[PDB]
Symmetry: C2
Subunit: 61 residues, 2 copies
């Protein structure tokens, strides 16, 4: 009685959590992609500020 019900509730909770995180992850990622394009389109400016933004975008750690 207990065990299966407890796990089913946990699954439901984790499913809602994953859905919210997925949407947030995609929302933020979308912004980064839009920003990456803006930087790319203006590479001809030789702007040090965009270089900083570019380096942030491509950083691994």
């Amino acid at each position: 009685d207990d065990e299966a019900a407890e796990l089913m509730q946990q699954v439901n909770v984790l499913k809602l959590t994953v859905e919210d995180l997925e949407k947030e992850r995609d929302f933020y990622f979308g912004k980064l992609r839009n920003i990456e394009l803006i930087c790319q389109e203006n590479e001809g400016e030789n702007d040090p500020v965009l270089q900083r933004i570019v380096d942030i975008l491509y950083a691994t750690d």
Copy 2:
């Protein structure tokens, strides 16, 4: 036998998924915050390109 075991496996899978998404969500979010600061520090430039980046950062949809 089946039910409880099936749900326990699903929980384990969802836990791993949430952990990965959380780290990705935070990774991307961190970049956006760093970029927001770069834009803020250079607001005195009146640069239309940074205005575009700022508007992307603050967009809701």
